[PDB]
Amino acid sequence: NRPNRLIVDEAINEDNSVVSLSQPKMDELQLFRGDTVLLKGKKRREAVCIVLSDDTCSDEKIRMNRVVRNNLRVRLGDVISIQPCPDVKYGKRIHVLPIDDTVEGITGNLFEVYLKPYFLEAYRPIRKGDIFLVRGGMRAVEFKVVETDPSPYCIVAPDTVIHCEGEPIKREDEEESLNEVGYDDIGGCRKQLAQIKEMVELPLRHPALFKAIGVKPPRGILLYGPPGTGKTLIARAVANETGAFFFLI
Amino acid sequence: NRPNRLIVDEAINEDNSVVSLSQPKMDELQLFRGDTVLLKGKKRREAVCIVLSDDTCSDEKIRMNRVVRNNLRVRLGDVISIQPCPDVKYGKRIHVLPIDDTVEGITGNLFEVYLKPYFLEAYRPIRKGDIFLVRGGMRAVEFKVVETDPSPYCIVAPDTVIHCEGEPIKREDEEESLNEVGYDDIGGCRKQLAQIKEMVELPLRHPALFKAIGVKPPRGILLYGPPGTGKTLIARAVANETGAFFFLINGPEIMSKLAGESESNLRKAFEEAEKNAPAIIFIDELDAIAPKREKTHGEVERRIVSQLLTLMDGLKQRAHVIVMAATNRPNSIDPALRRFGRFDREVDIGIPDATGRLEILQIHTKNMKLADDVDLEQVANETHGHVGADLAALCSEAALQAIRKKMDLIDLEDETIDAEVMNSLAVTMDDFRWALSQSNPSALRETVVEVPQVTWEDIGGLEDVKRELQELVQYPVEHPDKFLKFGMTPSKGVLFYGPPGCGKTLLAKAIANECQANAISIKGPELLTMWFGESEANVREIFDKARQAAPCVLFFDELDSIAKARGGNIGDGGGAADRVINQILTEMDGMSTKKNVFIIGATNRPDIIDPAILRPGRLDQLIYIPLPDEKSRVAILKANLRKSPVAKDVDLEFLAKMTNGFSGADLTEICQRACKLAIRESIESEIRRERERQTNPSAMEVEEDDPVPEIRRDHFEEAMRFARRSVSDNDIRKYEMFAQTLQQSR
Ligand SMILES: Nc1ncnc2c1ncn2[C@@H]1O[C@H](COP(=O)(O)OP(=O)(O)OP(=O)(O)O)[C@@H](O)[C@H]1O
Ligand SMILES: Nc1ncnc2c1ncn2[C@@H]1O[C@H](COP(=O)(O)OP(=O)(O)O)[C@@H](O)[C@H]1O
Ligand SMILES: Nc1ncnc2c1ncn2[C@@H]1O[C@H](COP(=O)(O)OP(=O)(O)O)[C@@H](O)[C@H]1O
């Protein structure tokens, strides 16, 4: 029922900095053309950037650059909460450095060979965590967050200073994406999983709600059984899916 | 001598601003129940309230609740004045304000829902400074009447306005809290609570009084029992209500730190308690600090034990601190701890009975909005193996299931949660059933110590046996003077022998219930467990539990179980004496008759038991429980069928006359058969009725009618065709010849 709760679907503009529109929806929003719209999804990672390079497709499904699925999302069928937040500050500039596929070949400055021809009159309305493709060549290389002089995201400008002293890395970021075990990874304990869910849903998903009442919560759980029955896996999946901070003692 | 002041006492009526008084002292003060009356209180206050006339309260003590005893700044053991107030006034606008942090985490004009019903029709005589309190929606919060448009004290009238505003103000330091635990929070240990009260009232409430005399106080209390039986709750409530400074010494907290650090912490705690005299030192999990001396492996643990011993001895020589301890078993702690002067009196907290479980459930549901179908009597009667905190977890599970059924399914995308939805939550019977069945581990597996619910009416026949047992049990304990007058020591044991199924167990339960005495039934499985495990020492603490529950009926069901496992009639080449039976004999010889702990033994094979247990002074009375005759069988059937609804067409006299030589438990098996056939008939009728009309697609076609709510004579006839003769006639002949050979033997 939430108006800005709408699916996201295929995208065709290979540049991630573009975010779609839906004129019937734009009338609902105040979506203005400029730097940024805050399109909010899962895990707090967003794809914030210039807007309105769409309305080619049908409505009820926002076109968002597929590269903002691995980030900000997982798969199709998801939903975006698009709400404008244009006119960001203009700090120094946003980091410039590649991550994986640039050490393979001539490196030079890692900015003025392949990436420079893209921060042109669209000076990176971004949000740290927006990952995309940008090159001056084979057209498949990532652009990741490394540094942060301004905490909030900004719109870069020339005359600034950048240091590509940083080195491209491994997929620490790709491994980070591959984590957070879930209930789909639990089998053979469906009744036990449901019991754990009904035990830990109220204390974790509703902390203030339970703080309002004066009932005693279940604060001790004894998962006992043969070794290798997924006890730590069950605990990790429950903590990750419910959002509770998991400490592996 | 100036009967204008009066003593304080607790209250059975919980409604605020209400009291109850002796009936004759209504003309003395010369005022009536409805007559609103003002009552004085120190620090220069007086609070007005309604009056009432009762009897249970003495002619010298008032009854009241913690709220007024808080605003009046007075505890029990004190005395105040009183005065009628026929000059009372109708309270106009008298502003109130939510005075606590409890206001935290809430929203809405809760004033309306909490107050308007609370004040409605109550004619609450209210004065300034009132700190009244009201409870709803899983929460309990109060208010203070800050303004009195007419001052100082007035009545409430429905017309009176409420401009309900203000910001939660800060309670001063003078007042206190009701969350602090009190005796109202203790259930299942009423006798134990009274014992603790009579132990700690003089040392704490009267420190200078006891300092005047030179008697030795009880400065060591050993609260032992199963974990979760409210030992720390009992200690906290006793310390808070009596005003003694409570220091929660935790065994893990003590010996969690370094050895020197642990000893320093113990010394600092004892010094602080001595400085805050009168104070209560409570040591839960004392076995952790103080294990058995032969068992404490680490030298650090022994050093900590000795440090605790020295600190408590220093309290004994020069202090005013009462030390309390909690442990699973009294023997688990060091025997040096229980030395005289250190831990003189040990209080067996034990387990709550059906009434105790009911009290605990009522305590835990006091602030819980629960429906009318809860029938906590039925829950408590069903609840077995749950002690204290087990029932607390049961109530918490029921509440959590109700919340997961309501919140997780109702308020998802509508709007943020407010107070209206949470205060509308209600706990149903299904939640309690689910908590009982699926989500409750019963931590109790040892012997039960409670007054059994089986009465004389639950037993059919055996009138002569009933009378003889009533004599042998009640007369020593109900008329001790008569026994002392004659030169005969009362008997402390009786043996029940006869065919199995005649109700020896019920005889013991009924004689325990008639005397209102706890019954500890040690069945044959327990005796065989002690025999096979080669642990005869368990009888020692069994008898200790029986003695601590005085008056108690120590029942030994199937006393011949060990003699039957170790061979039959003649058995092996060995004798009849057994190690567990021997320990029972030793304990009975060591048991004083005055301790009014009666030992009842049931033997289905009296000829195989050792005659040493039949020696005079232990089980000299051999009461024969004969196979029920016609009248006894009729009475047994009447007693059994009182629970199961049976149709009036049943003919109990005829059924008894068919059942020749049938035992009582065989008649209950007769109901098992017939009553179960009735249950199966009802179930099959229900399922066939469900299946028959599902084919017809009729929107309105319901021929609702109960198939049968009772048990007809057809079920009993089918049971007769199924159930057969009770026992072999040879066994009955053996019992009758044993009865004929009650003397001229050995
Ligand atoms: N019930 C299960 N369902 C799916 N995978 C399981 C299950 N139990 C164990 N595994 C898998 O076993 C692997 C190793 O087990 P893991 O390290 O999670 O410990 P664990 O099985 O929880 O151990 P323990 O029983 O000793 O606590 C993991 O890849 C985990 O996914
Ligand atoms: N007899 C009782 N009546 C009411 N509540 C109880 C009782 N026994 C235990 N509880 C509840 O159990 C909780 C913890 O029990 P606790 O006092 O720690 O038991 P123990 O002292 O035996 O360890 C307390 O919050 C208390 O409310
Ligand atoms: N005389 C009786 N009157 C009423 N009920 C009886 C009587 N005798 C036995 N019962 C009930 O029938 C069942 C069978 O009795 P049982 O316990 O075998 O007797 P005993 O304990 O003497 O062996 C018991 O559960 C008991 O509650």
GROMACS .gro file of N, CA and C in nm, chain A residues 70-119:
model
  150
   70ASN      N    1   2.302  -0.650  -0.742
   70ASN     CA    2   2.405  -0.707  -0.656
   70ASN      C    3   2.428  -0.619  -0.534
   71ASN      N    4   2.434  -0.489  -0.556
   71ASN     CA    5   2.429  -0.390  -0.449
   71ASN      C    6   2.284  -0.350  -0.425
   72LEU      N    7   2.256  -0.308  -0.302
   72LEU     CA    8   2.127  -0.248  -0.271
   72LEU      C    9   2.013  -0.348  -0.279
   73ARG      N   10   2.041  -0.470  -0.322
   73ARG     CA   11   1.938  -0.569  -0.351
   73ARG      C   12   2.006  -0.705  -0.367
   74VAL      N   13   1.930  -0.804  -0.412
   74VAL     CA   14   1.986  -0.935  -0.444
   74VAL      C   15   1.943  -0.977  -0.584
   75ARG      N   16   1.813  -0.974  -0.611
   75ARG     CA   17   1.756  -1.036  -0.730
   75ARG      C   18   1.639  -0.951  -0.780
   76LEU      N   19   1.559  -1.009  -0.869
   76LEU     CA   20   1.437  -0.944  -0.917
   76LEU      C   21   1.329  -0.952  -0.809
   77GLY      N   22   1.209  -0.905  -0.844
   77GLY     CA   23   1.097  -0.905  -0.752
   77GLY      C   24   1.112  -0.812  -0.634
   78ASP      N   25   1.225  -0.745  -0.620
   78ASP     CA   26   1.249  -0.657  -0.506
   78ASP      C   27   1.164  -0.531  -0.522
   79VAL      N   28   1.181  -0.437  -0.430
   79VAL     CA   29   1.105  -0.313  -0.430
   79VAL      C   30   1.198  -0.199  -0.390
   80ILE      N   31   1.178  -0.083  -0.451
   80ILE     CA   32   1.256   0.036  -0.421
   80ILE      C   33   1.167   0.136  -0.350
   81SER      N   34   1.228   0.217  -0.264
   81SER     CA   35   1.163   0.329  -0.198
   81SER      C   36   1.234   0.455  -0.246
   82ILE      N   37   1.185   0.511  -0.356
   82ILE     CA   38   1.251   0.624  -0.420
   82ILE      C   39   1.191   0.752  -0.364
   83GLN      N   40   1.277   0.836  -0.305
   83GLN     CA   41   1.237   0.959  -0.244
   83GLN      C   42   1.350   1.059  -0.270
   84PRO      N   43   1.323   1.174  -0.332
   84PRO     CA   44   1.433   1.263  -0.371
   84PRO      C   45   1.508   1.320  -0.251
   85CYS      N   46   1.639   1.334  -0.269
   85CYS     CA   47   1.724   1.413  -0.179
   85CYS      C   48   1.830   1.483  -0.263
   86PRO      N   49   1.788   1.573  -0.352
   86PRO     CA   50   1.884   1.643  -0.438
   86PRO      C   51   1.957   1.752  -0.360
   87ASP      N   52   2.039   1.828  -0.432
   87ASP     CA   53   2.115   1.938  -0.375
   87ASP      C   54   2.198   1.892  -0.256
   88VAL      N   55   2.290   1.800  -0.284
   88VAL     CA   56   2.387   1.760  -0.183
   88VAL      C   57   2.499   1.863  -0.179
   89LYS      N   58   2.575   1.862  -0.069
   89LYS     CA   59   2.691   1.948  -0.061
   89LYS      C   60   2.788   1.916  -0.174
   90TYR      N   61   2.883   2.006  -0.195
   90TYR     CA   62   2.990   1.987  -0.293
   90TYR      C   63   3.121   1.987  -0.216
   91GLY      N   64   3.158   1.870  -0.165
   91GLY     CA   65   3.284   1.857  -0.095
   91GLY      C   66   3.400   1.870  -0.191
   92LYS      N   67   3.518   1.824  -0.150
   92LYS     CA   68   3.632   1.825  -0.241
   92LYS      C   69   3.598   1.751  -0.368
   93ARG      N   70   3.579   1.620  -0.356
   93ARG     CA   71   3.553   1.531  -0.468
   93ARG      C   72   3.533   1.392  -0.411
   94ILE      N   73   3.490   1.297  -0.494
   94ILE     CA   74   3.474   1.158  -0.453
   94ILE      C   75   3.594   1.079  -0.502
   95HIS      N   76   3.636   0.982  -0.420
   95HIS     CA   77   3.744   0.891  -0.452
   95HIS      C   78   3.745   0.851  -0.599
   96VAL      N   79   3.864   0.840  -0.657
   96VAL     CA   80   3.885   0.773  -0.784
   96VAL      C   81   3.986   0.660  -0.764
   97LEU      N   82   3.940   0.536  -0.780
   97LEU     CA   83   4.032   0.422  -0.784
   97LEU      C   84   3.958   0.296  -0.829
   98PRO      N   85   4.016   0.214  -0.916
   98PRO     CA   86   3.956   0.085  -0.951
   98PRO      C   87   3.986  -0.019  -0.844
   99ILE      N   88   3.937  -0.141  -0.867
   99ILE     CA   89   3.944  -0.245  -0.764
   99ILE      C   90   4.008  -0.375  -0.813
  100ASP      N   91   3.960  -0.429  -0.925
  100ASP     CA   92   3.996  -0.566  -0.962
  100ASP      C   93   4.072  -0.575  -1.094
  101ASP      N   94   4.020  -0.516  -1.201
  101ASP     CA   95   4.063  -0.548  -1.336
  101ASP      C   96   4.150  -0.440  -1.401
  102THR      N   97   4.215  -0.355  -1.322
  102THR     CA   98   4.298  -0.250  -1.381
  102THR      C   99   4.447  -0.282  -1.375
  103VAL      N  100   4.493  -0.350  -1.270
  103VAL     CA  101   4.634  -0.391  -1.266
  103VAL      C  102   4.666  -0.480  -1.385
  104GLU      N  103   4.565  -0.545  -1.443
  104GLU     CA  104   4.583  -0.626  -1.563
  104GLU      C  105   4.598  -0.532  -1.682
  105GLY      N  106   4.722  -0.494  -1.712
  105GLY     CA  107   4.753  -0.404  -1.821
  105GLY      C  108   4.813  -0.274  -1.772
  106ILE      N  109   4.820  -0.178  -1.865
  106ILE     CA  110   4.878  -0.048  -1.833
  106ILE      C  111   4.795   0.019  -1.724
  107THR      N  112   4.862   0.062  -1.618
  107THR     CA  113   4.797   0.127  -1.504
  107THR      C  114   4.809   0.279  -1.508
  108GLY      N  115   4.928   0.332  -1.536
  108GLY     CA  116   4.945   0.476  -1.548
  108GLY      C  117   4.901   0.551  -1.424
  109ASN      N  118   4.788   0.621  -1.435
  109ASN     CA  119   4.729   0.693  -1.323
  109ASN      C  120   4.597   0.634  -1.276
  110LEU      N  121   4.539   0.540  -1.351
  110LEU     CA  122   4.414   0.474  -1.316
  110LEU      C  123   4.295   0.570  -1.317
  111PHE      N  124   4.320   0.697  -1.349
  111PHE     CA  125   4.214   0.797  -1.360
  111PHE      C  126   4.208   0.861  -1.498
  112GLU      N  127   4.323   0.904  -1.551
  112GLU     CA  128   4.327   0.987  -1.669
  112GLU      C  129   4.339   0.907  -1.798
  113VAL      N  130   4.325   0.775  -1.792
  113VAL     CA  131   4.338   0.690  -1.910
  113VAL      C  132   4.200   0.641  -1.952
  114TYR      N  133   4.123   0.588  -1.857
  114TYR     CA  134   3.996   0.523  -1.886
  114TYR      C  135   3.876   0.588  -1.819
  115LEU      N  136   3.892   0.646  -1.700
  115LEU     CA  137   3.779   0.692  -1.621
  115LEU      C  138   3.748   0.840  -1.639
  116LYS      N  139   3.847   0.921  -1.675
  116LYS     CA  140   3.830   1.065  -1.688
  116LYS      C  141   3.715   1.103  -1.782
  117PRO      N  142   3.687   1.027  -1.890
  117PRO     CA  143   3.586   1.075  -1.986
  117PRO      C  144   3.442   1.057  -1.941
  118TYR      N  145   3.419   1.030  -1.812
  118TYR     CA  146   3.285   1.003  -1.762
  118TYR      C  147   3.236   1.100  -1.655
  119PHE      N  148   3.325   1.167  -1.583
  119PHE     CA  149   3.284   1.268  -1.485
  119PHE      C  150   3.279   1.402  -1.558
   0.00000   0.00000   0.00000
